[PDB]
Amino acid sequence: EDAELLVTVRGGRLRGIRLKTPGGPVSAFLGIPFAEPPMGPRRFLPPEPKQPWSGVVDATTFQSVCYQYVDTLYPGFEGTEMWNPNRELSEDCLYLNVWTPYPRPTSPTPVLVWIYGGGFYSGASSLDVYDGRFLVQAERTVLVSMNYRVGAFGFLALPGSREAPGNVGLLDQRLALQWVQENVAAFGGDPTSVTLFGESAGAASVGMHLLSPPSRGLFHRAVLQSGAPNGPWATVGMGEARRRATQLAHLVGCPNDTELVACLRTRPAQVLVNHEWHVLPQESVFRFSFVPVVDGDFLSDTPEALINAGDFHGLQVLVGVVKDEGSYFLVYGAPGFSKDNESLISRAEFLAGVRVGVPQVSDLAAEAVVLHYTDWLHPEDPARLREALSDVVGDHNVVCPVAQLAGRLAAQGARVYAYVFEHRASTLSWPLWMGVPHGYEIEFIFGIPLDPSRNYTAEEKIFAQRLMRYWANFARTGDPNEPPQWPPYTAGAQQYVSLDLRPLEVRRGLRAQACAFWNRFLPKLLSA
Amino acid sequence: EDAELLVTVRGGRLRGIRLKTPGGPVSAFLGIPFAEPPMGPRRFLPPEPKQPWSGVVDATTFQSVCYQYVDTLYPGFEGTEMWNPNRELSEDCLYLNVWTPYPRPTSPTPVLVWIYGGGFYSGASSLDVYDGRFLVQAERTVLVSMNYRVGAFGFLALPGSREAPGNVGLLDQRLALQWVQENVAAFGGDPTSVTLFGESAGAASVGMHLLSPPSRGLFHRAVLQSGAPNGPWATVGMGEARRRATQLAHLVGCPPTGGNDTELVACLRTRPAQVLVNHEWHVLPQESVFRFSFVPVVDGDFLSDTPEALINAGDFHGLQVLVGVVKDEGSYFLVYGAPGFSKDNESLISRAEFLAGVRVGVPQVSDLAAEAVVLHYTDWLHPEDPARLREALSDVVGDHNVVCPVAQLAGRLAAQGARVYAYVFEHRASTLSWPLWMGVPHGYEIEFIFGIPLDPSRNYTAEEKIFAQRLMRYWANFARTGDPNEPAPQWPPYTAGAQQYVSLDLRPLEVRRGLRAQACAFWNRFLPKLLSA
Ligand SMILES: *[C@@H]1O[C@H](CO[C@@H]2O[C@@H](C)[C@@H](O)[C@@H](O)[C@@H]2O)[C@@H](O[C@@H]2O[C@H](CO)[C@@H](O)[C@H](O)[C@H]2NC(C)=O)[C@H](O)[C@H]1NC(C)=O
Ligand SMILES: *[C@@H]1O[C@H](CO[C@@H]2O[C@@H](C)[C@@H](O)[C@@H](O)[C@@H]2O)[C@@H](O[C@@H]2O[C@H](CO)[C@@H](O)[C@H](O)[C@H]2NC(C)=O)[C@H](O)[C@H]1NC(C)=O
Ligand SMILES: *[C@@H]1O[C@H](CO[C@@H]2O[C@@H](C)[C@@H](O)[C@@H](O)[C@@H]2O)[C@@H](O[C@@H]2O[C@H](CO)[C@@H](O)[C@H](O)[C@H]2NC(C)=O)[C@H](O)[C@H]1NC(C)=O
Ligand SMILES: NC(=O)c1cc[n+](COC[n+]2ccccc2/C=N/O)cc1
Ligand SMILES: NC(=O)c1cc[n+](COC[n+]2ccccc2/C=N\O)cc1
Ligand SMILES: *[C@@H]1O[C@H](CO)[C@@H](O)[C@H](O)[C@H]1NC(C)=O
Ligand SMILES: *[P@](C)(=O)/N=C(\C)N(CC)CC
Ligand SMILES: *[P@](C)(=O)/N=C(\C)N(CC)CC
């Protein structure tokens, strides 16, 4: 047999598989159990470490995807199917994967740990677009990705109860991070140089590990792509978490917190998934029902509170956004929008869409948004309205939260690097008016264009190797630059670079004007 | 005697003078009494019409300036002395002036009626910059200007009182308009073609005559320069007027606070005029700029509702309006209180001084409202640039008080039937005394409207003289026909949608869009809703 493909971790022995890349072989260990299956009486509970096993665990294929909603809006359309589960669904789903150079490294190797996004209601470490084979071959890293529970299974909260305490999906991730500390050395990885990176809800979870002391000792650097823990969508208060969990029980026919969760545990997993979206208070976009809860435990305060109160010297983070963060979300509830036309909306549809994009704010607050995003010399132009509503959803949910994190961390000791990803892939199936949509920098950071089975151009391949080197340079040293320089982001200069096929261009300000509204003014308005 | 210099009006006979102008003789009748002198027991009362006289009244020089405060900030400096009284102060001051071509016209000719500004606390029709001889000579119109009471004398109000009903300074204006209607035909003017035009507080007053029905029958067209009735400074509520009137009285001895209105006004009437003037600004509640102690009050009489509400409910079909502003409306006001500002340095303020100036520029608003102002006028990529902050604060003062009020008026009047024309005056005069950073400051289009550069004793360039002749022709064309275009790039009507206006400077007309539409949307559409919640 191949001795490179057999590893002993603390729980027992594993057998991996060898994989081809256009640059050479890679060792992969897929489907490693890191937790006891959170099933039956273990539903909603914090994860238990996987008990040791005898024999050899088969680690040659991906394990199951945690139970989650499956999108049906454009069935068969690649733009939507690429995020849908590609393995069967199961509550037995707490498995992580390790990619490693072939032969396995002899010296400690920097570790990248990937946390997928999916609004905390979906996602899987087994998606084609999170394939780690290209990064570990091109950049000689160890890549780890784990599955964590999503939707109600990971984030249903009855705050105060021990039978449904909340944030257990976050605890799944932390447990995998503890698994890396105890076991990644057996694969050649260096546990003293772990770099977290994630996108969207994955980027939010990275930030929440930055702000939870128990997790902070498990990694050393962080990359947050198109997400932040301080969004309007990434956390929920205790009282709202309790209301949503209670309405879920009523929707599925149940029923004392003990009697409520006991009844929920009798229900097939598909039943809860089928109802999770209907506990949201308002019709909205970019809002998810079961997200992390601020109960003083995992997060002792709100992310913004912890961000402003934090000393962040000794931290290096890489943060960024795509050029058009909002367009993707508009075809999922904004009236007048669809990927199959130009979506040139009326002002009425624009006004309606602002309530959908900024749900559960006062009429005055909504009118303040309309004032900022209206061009009062062209108040009714359909094309400008389309691009303005996408600016609303994108700035409110991604750009401005990212900008606040970058500015606060920078001014409070951290070295920050910011990017805007401005390249529209030649393969992109979405219409042209959506620009560079949310999520579509991931395929380049993982080096998917190097797969010769796809039709990326030669320059997109070179571009992918540029990005993989930036990311891996940051993992290795905390500086993405090769030793046109990428300057650190600071609260004053607000400098970032644009990532596309032409060389690095340094620009100033992550929509400083629009984000002054969201980050500085709008909070004060909601207080009064 | 010269027969052209003798006219009979209703009151009796007048004798005027023949003025020499650069272009030829003009007959002037200066100092025509139109009301009984508002003295002693007539202080604070509405004007009563001038009773008939026997013999010939010599209307041969400007009469006195209505008692008012005199600016002392930059003594001897032309930029401020030009606005100060150039006649003796007196409460006996209700006189008007008539300029007419020499010889008098035999068929009726259109009439322009000027209403000076001065924040309702100052101003006079006698100021050199309001000389009507050039307009009359160059464009063949009858020009009328009047004095009206200012300060407490014009606008101290104890609403509901008989002894001080308020708005008497506006009634001074209305009485003069009534005078024009009955008497201008004797000077050759056409009482069926009367165009009101004023600047700043004068522009605000012109608008209040548009919105008060009893005045609306006395003119046909209006020109509003750098002012509007709906500004945050041109009116005041009944209770605040009462509060200021009562504290003014308290500060000067009356009564020996509040109580009975007749007894209180009777006591105020025994106080010398200068004593009242010397305490007028002590009643303003906060440190501010572009705010004035005694202004028109909204008491349901002269104005049945606020100018905003009246503008919204108005049917303005059959009305032609000419409105506009200067390029840098707010700079002039910053050297009168804004921390760090001076006409003698470049006033490159700090950010702290910017934030402090915002409170001075927008007084008596919630902290939230002040943060909203700071949000829209900060450049969050250059938040502490001294020059950018200096221009931003001037934009705050200008947009808040002038530009956006004018814009809201222009847009609502256009949408509700009126043909509106709008300008931005963008020429900095070669003779200007203010520093360069102030740009084209508030009030400095007037001299070109009145054709002052044609005075040979002045030192304007030749091109500025042609510019003066162009603007006078615009204003006179609008007065005659309601259209400033000569019967040459055309001047399009302002509409709420297209929002077109023209720029006035030494270059030919340039059409533009939007009177600071982004800024004004904040002032006219958002902030009103913030202040209610
Ligand atoms: C563009 O299309 C959208 C969405 O319409 C859908 O996609 C179209 C391509 C076509 O397949 C339709 O049959 C689909 O319904 C339009 O937005 C909708 O417009 C209809 C009225 O025609 C309205 O009843 C819906 O409420 C709108 N969408 C939603 C979800 O409310 C939009 O009007 C189209 N704009 C164009 C054609 O310019
Ligand atoms: C408020 O006071 C006025 C004026 O009072 C007069 O003058 C005072 C100094 C003192 O001499 C009083 O006695 C005087 O009456 C009142 O107006 C007068 O009211 C009386 C009684 O009705 C009447 O005979 C007088 O003619 C009025 N004089 C006027 C109108 O000038 C007024 O009634 C008082 N109102 C109150 C107390 O609310
Ligand atoms: C610019 O000048 C202003 C006003 O100062 C006046 O003008 C000067 C040229 C000089 O003639 C002074 O004597 C005048 O008083 C300055 O603002 C003042 O600054 C002083 C000193 O710091 C302070 O005590 C006053 O309170 C300030 N007054 C106001 C109204 O703010 C300003 O600091 C100068 N800025 C410069 C020079 O850049
Ligand atoms: N009656 C008063 O005491 C008084 C005091 C101050 N002001 C305002 O004057 C300051 N000011 C402020 C801005 C522009 C001009 C001027 C001066 N004009 O004469 C008016 C009345
Ligand atoms: N549990 C939920 O809140 C939820 C949210 C969204 N969706 C799917 O519909 C929204 N949607 C559909 C397609 C793509 C994106 C999105 C929204 N956010 O990502 C299902 C369940
Ligand atoms: C691009 O790739 C897809 C999937 O491999 C393939 O089906 C398609 O044929 C390629 N391009 C074209 C135009 O053939
Ligand atoms: P974020 C809102 O967590 N990301 C989502 C919803 N993605 C799917 C389009 C990217 C993984
Ligand atoms: P407005 C505020 O009435 N105008 C003023 C105070 N001026 C003085 C320069 C212009 C006449």
Curated annotation (Swiss-Prot), chain A:
The gene is ACHE. Changing residue 438 to A: Loss of activity. It comes from Homo sapiens (Human). Its main location: other. This is Acetylcholinesterase. GO terms for cellular component: basement membrane; cell surface; extracellular region; extracellular space; Golgi apparatus; membrane; neuromuscular junction; nucleus. PROSITE patterns: CARBOXYLESTERASE_B_1, CARBOXYLESTERASE_B_2. Pfam families: AChE_tetra, COesterase. It catalyses: acetylcholine + H2O = choline + acetate + H(+). Belongs to the type-B carboxylesterase/lipase family. It is found in: Synapse; Secreted; Cell membrane. Keywords: Blood group antigen, Cell membrane, Disulfide bond, Glycoprotein, GPI-anchor, Hydrolase, Lipoprotein, Membrane, Neurotransmitter degradation, Nucleus, Secreted, Serine esterase, Signal, Synapse. Isoform H is highly expressed in erythrocytes. The lineage of its organism: Eukaryota, Metazoa, Chordata, Craniata, Vertebrata. Disulfide bonds join 66-93, 254-263, 400-515. InterPro entries: AB_hydrolase_fold (IPR029058), AChE-related_enzymes (IPR050654), AChE_tetra (IPR014788), CarbesteraseB (IPR002018), Carboxylesterase_B_AS (IPR019826), Carboxylesterase_B_CS (IPR019819), Cholinesterase (IPR000997).
